[PDB]
């Protein structure tokens, strides 16, 4: 609900609080069928223009079917298949003899129906397009009996419209080797997705959540090609199940913290590592290091726990006491003092070093703050942009409250001569141990 922020002057880091979690922990697989007709030969001696148009669209249908057939013969084994294994396990069941007839019977009278497969999975199946009925009722009388009947122009247009979804599904599945993500409206219309959300064995609060964030749901779903066999095109849609809901989530922002001496080459730097999204999860903290794995929509984060690390809840103490013995706070060291800025949720961190011109402006007043050398921060209240060198950054104009937590920059507690610079994924105590070892070589002399 309320977004807040905290800048820690001592460590050149900020934490954006108040976000609610939605972490993916399960998969809900569903079978999507398209009833095909298997027509073959069309003896046609008629040259009528309407007949040519029908036979042309019929060839686009036959090629789409043969393309899906050579696509299903080749079964991809790329990546670790660890995130589609649930849907892939369903495709192996669909390949069983008699199994396509079971789903074929349930969708005889209705479009949607729950089916208990021969492996105990009660999947929700769906007949989203019925080409067997259209081709066999409206098209066969036009291309059998030796000479073609003349179809009306409405039929020529109606068949291009119905056949189009088959061709586009074949188009996406061909370039992506049978596995598409996000799931497009051709694979599943918004109307079908929302109806599928309603039919899911989930809570009413979870149906409201997925229905209000369908675009994020599509981006966290998979469409897997199964089999085309016996006048049935089947493919599995894997939708996310968010097992973790409304747990506090926060985003850590970090920026280099160097000393500001006047003789260059005598300065040492330090940067907190593991910036990104953190969410409370089952007595621990789920950390997401990669930037593209979490979508945020209005204070709710939607993450996939597949690309997370599980950390003890004491990892949060790097935000209140970085020198705290319960968790070994990770840092990186260097002597590379290049200016930069980080746009946070409610403001901007600015690390200004050397001769760089760093400033913060309001659109109508101009420069309202000039940063000096070191690491500093400014809230978005009254600030529109931040300029660092030749680069202009826009501050997020989101409502919230920032808190500037003053403190001595910790880089000032380190003697430069014995500082271990050039270390990457190092801990606070690792740096201290290298300092205790470098102090013993001077102790003897």
């Amino acid at each position: 609900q309320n977004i807040t922020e905290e800048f820690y002057q001592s460590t050149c880091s900020a934490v954006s609080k108040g976000y609610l979690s939605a972490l993916r922990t399960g998969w809900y697989t569903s079978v999507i069928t398209i009833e095909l007709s298997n027509i073959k030969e069309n003896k046609c001696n008629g040259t009528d223009a309407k007949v040519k148009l029908i036979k042309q669209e019929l060839d686009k249908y036959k090629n789409a079917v043969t393309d899906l057939q050579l696509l299903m013969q080749s079964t991809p084994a790329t990546g670790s298949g660890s995130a589609i294994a649930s849907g892939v396990a369903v495709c192996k069941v669909l390949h069983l003899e008699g199994e396509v007839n079971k789903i074929k019977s349930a969708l005889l009278s209705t479009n949607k129906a729950v089916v208990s497969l021969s492996n105990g999975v009660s999947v929700l199946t769906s007949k989203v397009l019925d080409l067997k009925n259209y081709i066999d009722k409206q098209l066969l009388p036009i291309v059998n009996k030796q000479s073609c009947s003349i179809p009306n122009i409405e039929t020529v247009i109606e068949f291009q419209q119905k056949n189009n979804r088959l061709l586009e599904i074949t188009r996406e599945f061909s370039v992506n080797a049978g596995v598409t993500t996000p799931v497009s409206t051709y694979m599943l219309t918004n109307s079908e997705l929302l109806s599928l959300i309603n039919d899911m064995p989930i809570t009413n609060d979870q149906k409201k959540l997925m229905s209000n964030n369908v675009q994020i749901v599509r981006q966290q779903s998979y469409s897997i090609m199964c089999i085309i066999k016996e006048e049935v095109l089947a493919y599995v849609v894997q939708l996310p199940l968010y097992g973790v809901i409304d747990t506090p989530c926060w985003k850590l922002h970090t920026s280099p913290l160097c000393t500001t001496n006047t003789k260059e080459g005598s300065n040492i730097c330090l940067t907190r590592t593991d910036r990104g999204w953190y969410c409370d999860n089952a007595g621990s903290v789920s950390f997401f290091p990669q930037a593209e794995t979490c979508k945020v929509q209005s204070n709710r984060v939607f993450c996939d726990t597949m690309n997370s690390l599980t950390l003890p809840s004491e990892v949060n103490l790097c935000n209140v006491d970085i020198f705290n013995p319960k968790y070994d706070c990770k840092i990186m060291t260097s002597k590379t003092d290049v200016s930069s800025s980080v746009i946070t949720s409610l403001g901007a961190i600015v690390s200004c070093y050397g001769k760089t011109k760093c400033t913060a402006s309001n659109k109508n007043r101009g420069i309202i703050k000039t940063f000096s050398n070191g690491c500093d921060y400014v809230s978005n209240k009254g600030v529109d942009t931040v300029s660092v060198g030749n680069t202009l950054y826009y501050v997020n104009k989101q409502e919230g409250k920032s808190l500037y937590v003053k403190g001595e920059p910790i880089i000032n507690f380190y003697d430069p001569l014995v500082f271990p610079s050039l270390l990457f994924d190092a801990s606070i105590s690792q740096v201290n141990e290298k300092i205790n070892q470098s102090l013993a070589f001077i102790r003897k002399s």
Copy 2:
């Protein structure tokens, strides 16, 4: 105009000169409107095939509108929104009461018109599609008055053509959460983009530049979904403003420089860091470290200063004197002598080590040069390919002149016993300081 290159044998690096800059420094936002009709209920008792086709296409229009409505209810907050903040600020203005009516009045008689918003921004708006006029004039008489009028077959076809752009715009905006880049021809036709370039408050030389590189302009633009309200679909197009033009730009290429001793494990390596694009910018140098942030078209580089670092102009002295005290030239060290090649603008750098077979061939003559162990270079004049191990590289056949700058490889100035290997983002003086400290422990003994 004239592309030139310089290979520095001493540092196993090359610089491609003669490129002209175009750096993005501003945004030009523009509002694109599509006039919708808001039709609701269609009482139809007619089963005529033309009437069915019209009602089917009308349902595809109503679903596209409801999809855009649930897309605008959910307002994405992903990334730092720092590069769309200008267009996002316009969407907040469009949400003001009475503001959609202002743009609604200016586009009453013409398609394009400049509008001064209630926040001082004079945006260029555009009515690119008029569905309210088509639906209300050609379609309502067909689906009101209790029984349907029969439309001619030309109307069935004309409505599928007009409604198509709405459906494709809804398709792109749904899978991308309202923010698309590059900007497609559905969001803005080439005809509309070029007319928008002509109508921009920019110089005539800048209009000629953006019009001759429209594909790069699309790739550096954003299309942001605003609001659908009161028979208006509005979305913001953010086009790049290139504040830096025709400044010299150059590309640094680097490759590992190792020693070539005959006993493996006794060799030390060194590689210049910060390879990429450099452009002179406002008395400093704008550096672009990531590879996908700069598009080159005929000697002009098109960069976004958002992903640049601002460096002092002395950074260029690493190209003429790497041991120069005005700038601390950055390197990385190791003992990893694996062969590789870098295809430059006018030739190829080859780092050959161990037993690797390195060569340069002409298509009809065969092998014309065999590289020995170390770092070397060959121009594209007479060379077509370069082979390193089991890999074949093609040399760019672009016209230009290469200059081979001979010099002693600097890795030979380092005593191996005290060389600091295994260092990554290290400076020349950092390595020298580790060498002065390792020489003091031998001095005492």
Copy 3:
């Protein structure tokens, strides 16, 4: 044929064996032409609805042609053009005067024909669409002679179908600056690709290979825009030639190996580097470090040797003896004991450290194995999932046989006080040399 796996308990690494190679070593370029008509002015005074539809579709054709013209004026020079240089060399030939007429003559009577260009390249050309014949035969009589003839409604529909492929090709080429990959069905239909495979100067076993993996072939192909000139639209399709076939290939999986002491901060870690795909190639080993450069379909790996490194065949000895003097086995060191898992081809590696809950379950029996602290492994026979912390991984259910190679974890052979931690791309002997140097400072005291 038979997939096997080997987990090495001593190094916390696994090797998936039995895969067959298909490495790209060459390019087969081919010219794809679309015959255009160059119609200009359409004097039309008729307001007939069929005439409007024809003139509307004719404007979509003229804009597609002018868009391809401004696309070919701007010739992109992005990337190093090292992987399209073969097709780009063909575009420079097509720009020669008289050269478009040569391909224009061979495709006068047939759709496909081999053409010897004026640079010695015998390319296979193709007339995939004939718009000059359709526009000049069916459309000109409708828009010349001062007043328009009335076309039948079949012609209105037939022209939207034929013109569609031109518009989609223009759509893809515009957003991608003339170079598209993978190659879509609009650039080349599956029917045209398979016919092109049949017409290629390759072995019959190679035609069967590319035809059974057309989707991988598309993903490893390029479509390059050449020229639109003199009623000809020409573009080059670059298809992969797999010069390395059926050589053994294997995939190395690595995971951190730490000590399991009870006092945290007293533990040291080690991880094998260079995980990925290895294939025997011409007496050496071709290594692929990036994850997206190799597609696997049923035991065959399809790699591009462009993004490989050539290593001596002794690199495989890191899998049988990591302490072996023929190859300096690379590792990275640290003290960062965070739990993780790696899903391999036939099982899962689990590195469990600290308080993390690590387990392996069967869908119906529940937890069947609890991992203790250290690095361990489980086969997919009887295991469905592996849980580490708050993350659930799915094991690949592929048939094969795993071999658990027991051995002492090599991290136990290192004295912690003198262990060099914090090293990244370091060799076994590099770590040993840092240990021999740290042992001399204690020897004197």
